[PDB]
Structures are given as C-alpha cells and as structure tokens.
Design a protein around this ligand. Sequence first.
Ligand SMILES: *[C@@H]1O[C@H](CO)[C@@H](O[C@@H]2O[C@H](CO)[C@@H](O[C@@H]3O[C@H](CO)[C@@H](O)[C@H](O)[C@@H]3O)[C@H](O)[C@H]2NC(C)=O)[C@H](O)[C@H]1NC(C)=O
Ligand SMILES: *[C@@H]1O[C@H](CO)[C@@H](O[C@@H]2O[C@H](CO)[C@@H](O[C@@H]3O[C@H](CO)[C@@H](O)[C@H](O)[C@@H]3O)[C@H](O)[C@H]2NC(C)=O)[C@H](O)[C@H]1NC(C)=O
Ligand SMILES: *[C@@H]1O[C@H](CO)[C@@H](O[C@@H]2O[C@H](CO)[C@@H](O[C@@H]3O[C@H](CO)[C@@H](O)[C@H](O)[C@@H]3O)[C@H](O)[C@H]2NC(C)=O)[C@H](O)[C@H]1NC(C)=O
Lengths: 48, 80, 73
Amino acid sequence: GNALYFKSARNVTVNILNDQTKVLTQLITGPKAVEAYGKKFEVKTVSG
Amino acid sequence: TSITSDIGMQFFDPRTQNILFSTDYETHEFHLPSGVKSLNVQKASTERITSNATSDLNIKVDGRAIVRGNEGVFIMGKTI
Amino acid sequence: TKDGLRLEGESEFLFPLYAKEIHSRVDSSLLLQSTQNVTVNARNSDGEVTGRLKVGPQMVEVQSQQFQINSRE
Ligand SMILES: *[C@@H]1O[C@H](CO)[C@@H](O[C@@H]2O[C@H](CO)[C@@H](O[C@@H]3O[C@H](CO)[C@@H](O)[C@H](O)[C@@H]3O)[C@H](O)[C@H]2NC(C)=O)[C@H](O)[C@H]1NC(C)=O
Ligand SMILES: *[C@@H]1O[C@H](CO)[C@@H](O[C@@H]2O[C@H](CO)[C@@H](O[C@@H]3O[C@H](CO)[C@@H](O)[C@H](O)[C@@H]3O)[C@H](O)[C@H]2NC(C)=O)[C@H](O)[C@H]1NC(C)=O
Ligand SMILES: *[C@@H]1O[C@H](CO)[C@@H](O[C@@H]2O[C@H](CO)[C@@H](O[C@@H]3O[C@H](CO)[C@@H](O)[C@H](O)[C@@H]3O)[C@H](O)[C@H]2NC(C)=O)[C@H](O)[C@H]1NC(C)=O
C-alpha cells in the first residue's frame, strides 16, 4: 500500500565493496547520467 | 549488474519522451549503432561485399566454403 | 552497546528518515522490496528530480539525459 523511495539532493552512488573496501561494480544515478560501472551487464527474461 | 523481468530494460530521455533504448524487440525495431568494429550475425542478406581501395578482401573460413550460383558464376580476374 | 546499538525488531518509522551512508550487514545480503514499485531519485540544486532508477511493477525504467556503461577502469 505504499511506495518505498530513495531521494537526495545529489548523486545516489550505489556501490559494492570487497573485503579491502575497493569498488568492483558501481551504479551512480546522477543528475544527468546514469552510469553502471562494473565488469559486465545483463538483461535476462524469466525463462532464461 | 544483472536485471530481470518479463519485458526487460528500458530508457528514454525525458527531454524528448522518445524511447532511446528498449529490449522488447517485437515493439521497437533495432538499429545499427555507430562505431562498430565487427558484427557476428548468424544470417546475412548482402547485395554486395567489397573492400576499400587499399587492401584485399579475404573470404577466409576454418569451415568449408559452398558458393552456389543458381543462374551461374562468372570469375573475372587477371591471375586466377 | 558500547560502540553502537543493536536492534532485533521491526523499527517502523512513522515519519521520514535521514542518513548519509546506508550499509548492509557483512554476513547478510540487503533486500528491499514492495508491492507497487521502488524508486531511487536524485535531484538538482533546485530540488528537481532529474535521474530516476525506477523498478516498476513489470519492467525497469531509467530516466536521464545519458546512460553510460564502462569498465572498472
Ligand atoms: C508506484 O507506486 C506508487 C505508490 O503506490 C504509485 O503512486 C500512486 O499513483 C496513483 C495514480 O496517480 C495515485 O492515485 C491518485 O494520485 C493523485 C495524485 O497524482 C491523487 O490526487 C489521487 O487522490 C489519487 O491518490 C496514488 O495516490 C499514488 N500513491 C502514492 C503513495 O503517492 C505509482 O503510480 C506507482 N507507479 C506506477 C507506474 O503505477
Ligand atoms: C555525480 O554524478 C555525475 C554524473 O556521473 C558526475 O559527473 C561526472 O563526474 C566525472 C568525475 O568527476 C567527470 O569526469 C571528469 O572529467 C574531466 C574532464 O571533463 C576530468 O578532468 C576529470 O578528471 C574527471 O575525469 C565528468 O565530467 C562529470 N560529468 C558531468 C556531466 O558532470 C559527478 O562527478 C558525480 N559527483 C559525485 C560527488 O559523485
Ligand atoms: C582501407 O583499408 C585498409 C585495410 O583495412 C585500412 O588500413 C588499415 O586501417 C586500420 C584502421 O585505420 C589500421 O588499424 C590501426 O592502424 C594503426 C596504425 O595504422 C595501428 O597502430 C592500430 O593498432 C590499428 O591496427 C590498420 O593498421 C591499417 N592497415 C594498413 C595495412 O594500412 C585503411 O585505413 C583503409 N582506408 C580507408 C580510407 O578506409
């Protein structure tokens, strides 16, 4: 019955850190560009 | 950075309201992107294959080459 | 606790939340779900939401002026 949100006045820099706190994949939703850094990308369907 | 759904990925610039990229292929037709080095398509309908004015075409294949001329073949060249 | 405070219960915030860094536990994977949709938003200096990463009921939408993909380098 409600929509969970995430907001900010700036970038939302979703990232992942290894045990050494080093970035491996990143997803930065900024004001102008939505970057998806990483080692890959995929889009699958339900059946695979 | 995996994604998953029944329909798929989407993106449209809100300053045009035009779907700049989608993955429901039946609806929006795919177009060739710019800056492509090679493309490996499993079936091609090519009217003509030609090189540029510098180097040689090389129809090279590890598999077998089966060229079939339904109305006939014509080989024109200097040293054949 | 001494260095922090551990909570094992459903901390329903009946009013908004604010923070700077939202983490997940080391031994458990963060999950975030709903029934209608989940929205990530980002705003300009005038508060105008300009880049949206929306996971709608059926299929994802990204709304922005650009959509890059790079490697780690
Ligand atoms: C994603 O989830 C949210 C929350 O369920 C959806 O927002 C909801 O949208 C409907 C359709 O507009 C709202 O109903 C009506 O909204 C107008 C304001 O535009 C209001 O004046 C009416 O009285 C009526 O409530 C609904 O309120 C709104 N919910 C919330 C919490 O704001 C949204 O539509 C969902 N996305 C999609 C693509 O469906
Ligand atoms: C929030 O997100 C935006 C969009 O991704 C970031 O803007 C971009 O940030 C990068 C890195 O700061 C900029 O690259 C820079 O390019 C200049 C040359 O133009 C170079 O000299 C720098 O060393 C750097 O590589 C990029 O230009 C910039 N693009 C735009 C459109 O703003 C922004 O940095 C992010 N901010 C934060 C705090 O994460
Ligand atoms: C006409 O076709 C020939 C044959 O492909 C082209 O020559 C080749 O052009 C490519 C791309 O321009 C060259 O690749 C790059 O070359 C640079 C230096 O030349 C090298 O440092 C890079 O690592 C990369 O290999 C390629 O070397 C070049 N080969 C030869 C023998 O010239 C030519 O550019 C085409 N001309 C036009 C107008 O289309």
